[PDB]
Write a protein of this length. Structure first.
Length: 330
């Protein structure tokens, strides 16, 4: 089998992407944030504290003839941005782009943190990291991809995120018309539960490529590109007037600037992030100070190849017995 679904930016900055997901019988369609940095499929629901729902579409398991409470199971998650959610668990039928999994764990939120409530466009998350990170207790549950992968034509999914435009998540096949050149594959460590790999270096604008190993994760659920302080300083030094602002929380730059590209290495291959992809707009409405899309990871503990990086590529998440990642230009 295969599946193919369009993913759409939630706003004019590409802050996140939503993909429609069918849950239950009859189908309840929710727009979920596909997140290769986490491993829970959780949704706003009829059980979510009413004051914490503000415009989201909810899953109502009592209206699904295939929903079954997973007795005794609870979940609770906290993300790298400080947000969190928790609740109980149902199993139900879940379909993405024509690919159906029966008995998928659907984690129903009883509580969500304010940042989720305040984002009416995201009805939940669909985790695509390794199932070892799934938070369901006392019996850890499998991701949608883990449940589907034996049935797929090939045990892979691909992320093709758009810049200011829709893109595509495919399951089970590699669309050879969706990229240019070849796909360069690179080793993955699953020791932390992430799609963790090592970039071979970087360049700023038309500058020379610096060969240096940068370990990080491919994370569709993170907006920005978080890299070591040395790398980030070298980038913003090429933007007149850019500075790190402790009060704002990262590098800012004059909105009148033209940003240079940023290149990252994948083996001997190179992925070029155009400068425009690094502009996240005014820090507050009407400001002429703009927020940068490349930020230091120094306070995170891990480097993160978020959407800023991934949307410059066609990305293959190869879930073979030994997983690998593939990147192509597009």
């Amino acid at each position: 089998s295969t599946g193919s679904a369009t993913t759409t930016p939630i706003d004019s900055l590409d802050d996140a992407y939503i993909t429609p997901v069918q849950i239950g019988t009859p189908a309840q369609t929710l727009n979920l944030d596909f997140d290769t940095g986490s491993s829970d499929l959780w949704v706003f629901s009829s059980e979510t504290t009413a004051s914490e729902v503000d415009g989201q579409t909810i899953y109502t398991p009592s209206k699904s003839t295939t929903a079954k409470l997973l007795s005794g199971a609870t979940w609770s998650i906290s993300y790298g941005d400080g947000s969190s959610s928790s609740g109980d668990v149902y199993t139900d039928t879940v379909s993405v782009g024509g690919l159906t999994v029966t008995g998928q764990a659907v984690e129903s939120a009883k509580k969500v943190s304010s940042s989720f409530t305040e984002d009416s466009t995201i009805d939940g998350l669909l985790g695509l990291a390794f199932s070892t990170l799934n938070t369901v207790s006392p019996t850890q549950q499998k991701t949608f991809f883990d449940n589907a992968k034996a049935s797929l034509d090939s045990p892979v999914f691909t992320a093709d995120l758009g810049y200011h435009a829709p893109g595509t998540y495919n399951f089970g096949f590699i669309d050879t018309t969706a990229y240019t050149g070849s796909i360069t594959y690179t080793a993955v460590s699953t020791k932390q539960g992430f799609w963790e790999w090592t970039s071979t270096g970087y360049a700023v604008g038309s500058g020379t490529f610096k060969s240096t190993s940068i370990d990080g994760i491919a994370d569709t659920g993170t907006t920005l590109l978080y890299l070591p302080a040395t790398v980030v300083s070298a980038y913003w030094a090429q933007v007149s007037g850019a500075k790190s602002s402790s009060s704002v929380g990262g590098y800012v730059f004059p909105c009148s600037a033209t940003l240079p590209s940023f290149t990252f290495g994948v083996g001997s291959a190179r992925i070029v992030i155009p400068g425009d992809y690094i502009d996240f707009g005014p820090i507050s409405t009407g400001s002429s100070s703009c927020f940068g899309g490349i930020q230091s990871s120094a306070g995170i503990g891990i480097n993160i190849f978020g959407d800023v990086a991934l949307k410059a590529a066609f990305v293959v998440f190869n879930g073979a017995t030994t997983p690998t990642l593939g990147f192509a230009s597009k």
